[PDB]
Amino acid sequence: FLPVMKLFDLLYPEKEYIPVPDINKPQSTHAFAMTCIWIHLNRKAQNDNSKLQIPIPHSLRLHHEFLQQSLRNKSLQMNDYKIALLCNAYSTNSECFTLPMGALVETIYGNGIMRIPLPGTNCMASGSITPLPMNLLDSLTVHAKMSLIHSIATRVIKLAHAKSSVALAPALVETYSRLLVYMEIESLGIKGFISQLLPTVFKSHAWGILHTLLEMFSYRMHHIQPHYRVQLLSHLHTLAAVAQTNQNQLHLCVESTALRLITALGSSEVQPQFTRFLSDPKTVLSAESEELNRALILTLARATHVTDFFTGSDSIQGTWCKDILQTIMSFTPHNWASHTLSCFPGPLQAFFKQNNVPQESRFNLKKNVEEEYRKWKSMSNENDIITHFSMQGSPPLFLCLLWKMLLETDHINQIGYRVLERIGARALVAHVRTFADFLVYEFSTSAGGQQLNKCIEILNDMVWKYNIVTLDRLILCLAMRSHEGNEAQVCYFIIQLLLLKPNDFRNRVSDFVKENSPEHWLQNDWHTKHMNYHKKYPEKLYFEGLAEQVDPPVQIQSPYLPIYFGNVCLRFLPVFDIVIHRFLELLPVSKSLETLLDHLGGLYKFHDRPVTYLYNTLHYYEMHLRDRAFLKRKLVHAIIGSLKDNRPQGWCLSDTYLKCAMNAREENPWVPDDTYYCRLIGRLVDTMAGKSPGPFPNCDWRFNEFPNPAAHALHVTCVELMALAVSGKEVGNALLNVVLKSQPLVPRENITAWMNAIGLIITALPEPYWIVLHDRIVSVIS
């Protein structure tokens, strides 16, 4: 380290003291840097003290005196950045470090003060709700951040080992989420989170800490390297295999977290990640929940479609997909619907043409439901009732029983809640599954009218008034069925009415989007607005409304787990992505998608990756959206205009798109000219060349879905090109004619960067856009 001294002599020729700057800037921590270097050299020279003692220079005595006085002060607060300077300078001290260390940790851990309540019942957490700001953590060094990380990790380990019901501090988990962003503390960070911290939290059987960490990973993690994501998926599956999870709150959390990790697997990470888990396929698959396996198959479909993995082949054998799909065939016999199967790659269709498992008839299901209905109305001994209707391995029809009960008696006796409590969370989703088939068969056979509104009202009361099923769980189990024709139309009609006939979801969605913002790194008052929402719309998870409306009112006092981030609106979102894909897959239900995006469209403000979602959607459903330009327009305008408040002007769409194609159609679709395409590719060549104004405003890539500005430019350019109403051949020919035809605005001596951007753009587009290069080669060969 000694060669830093001649560098300091080169950069700092001075005669006198260098004045102390203003402490109320973060960048003033950059002004003190060479003195912190000198302190770090002195503390190393303390070993063999007189041998090579390092005196402070004459220029740096003033800053050293300021640091000495500020350490000597013991009235120290977080209002300025003096605390950061003290941590940075004395991070290499044994006992001189603890004086700022406790000073900033005690503000976020919150010992002594009070216990503040998390929502539900029986939740109490430590007092502190305000986390460290981002500029403070950015103005520490790496060693201060490593020490803060290791301190917080030991605190959570200790509170895990204390078996306490006092939950973790909100400021603590917000700050820990903000600190796992930094990939330069990597071996102490996410690597330790998944390799060390989470297995020990599972080992001590906490479930209080485990739920916080799964919630933080679902709602506060942005850039995770993919092998950590697949390792965490494996750990979620082993967790769901064990832990006797009658806790609906824990099982719901782990299932929604695995659903959030499957559908956000990027399109090019799938093959190099899943070739490492090939010999052990069971580790990364669910064995009981079918819906996660279906989500994994759909992610495989769009991943091998977007990257075009299967061209140059037509046999699924000899590939890594065959082992995964075979191990999903065992543990989950499930047959995909035709409208859904028609969108797959070829070899997936050839695989799913065979391995078709037959299913039960509609009338046999109706007869079985009526058998258990008469058996409920006849038998009367309570423990035999509870044991028979929850026999494991019996055909699960209990939610259909409840449907028929409150269809006409309009109440439930005391015993049904006891049966539900003895069923548990794991079998209950099988009951929701058969209930979904029963729903679509009975809704198909029901005469539409006032009986239909009676059925939709009792389904709504089953969801909200009685809290038997969570909304996203029910909609996921409806949308992932295998029904054909008008039965599929009835199922998606059920989903549209269930989202749109009552007020019970539109109220929560509107109230959440009007009063919250997605930039959680810029917010310090998150827990206040979180408690405002969870007061105003409480989320009950252990059958609370059913426990109230049972005629001897059974008082349950089961403990809830910590909830800092989670609610129904932010648990509905991946299911809403899957549902929008289902509405695009089926033809005659597009008006339901229009009204869904009109009502619930602003909820996409909180989608962690909207542009990648649009790219995957328009890229995978391009053959379907070829002739429905209005629907594709409505989708991209809803998803983008949901975000027009947070993100700056001109972040995604070009202004000349905003001025022309934001109009309705009068049978004059705006056909763009060559200046438009020259502007688009100019934006990409200017982000990739590096430009100081920059055609896009600059964001914080630690917190986006795109790692660099170039990937952002490329994805929003491809979304804008696919969102046009002009067909693929004209867009591809116009992109080629940017460079092929003679053009001003495209400078000579800069032509190779323009050809580079055309290569990146037209490669990232679907098949009918980049197929035109073959026609141009044929045109010049002849």
CSV table of C-alpha atoms in Angstrom, one decimal, residues 77 93 164 175 340 367 395 409 428 440 459 554 596 622 662 671-672 706 734 780:
chain,number,residue,atom,x,y,z
A,77,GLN,CA,-26.8,12.1,15.3
A,93,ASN,CA,-10.2,0.0,14.6
A,164,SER,CA,-39.0,-14.9,20.3
A,175,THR,CA,-32.1,-1.6,5.2
A,340,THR,CA,-52.6,-22.9,-25.0
A,367,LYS,CA,-72.9,-37.3,-8.8
A,395,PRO,CA,-61.8,-37.2,-4.0
A,409,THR,CA,-79.0,-22.5,3.5
A,428,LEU,CA,-56.8,-27.3,0.3
A,440,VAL,CA,-67.0,-24.0,-14.6
A,459,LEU,CA,-68.4,-17.0,-4.8
A,554,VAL,CA,-65.4,-19.9,17.3
A,596,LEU,CA,-59.6,-5.5,-17.3
A,622,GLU,CA,-46.9,-12.2,-32.3
A,662,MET,CA,-51.7,7.8,-29.3
A,671,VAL,CA,-47.8,4.7,-41.3
A,672,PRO,CA,-44.4,5.8,-40.2
A,706,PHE,CA,-32.2,-3.7,-17.2
A,734,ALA,CA,-37.7,-0.1,-43.2
A,780,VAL,CA,-28.8,-8.6,-54.7
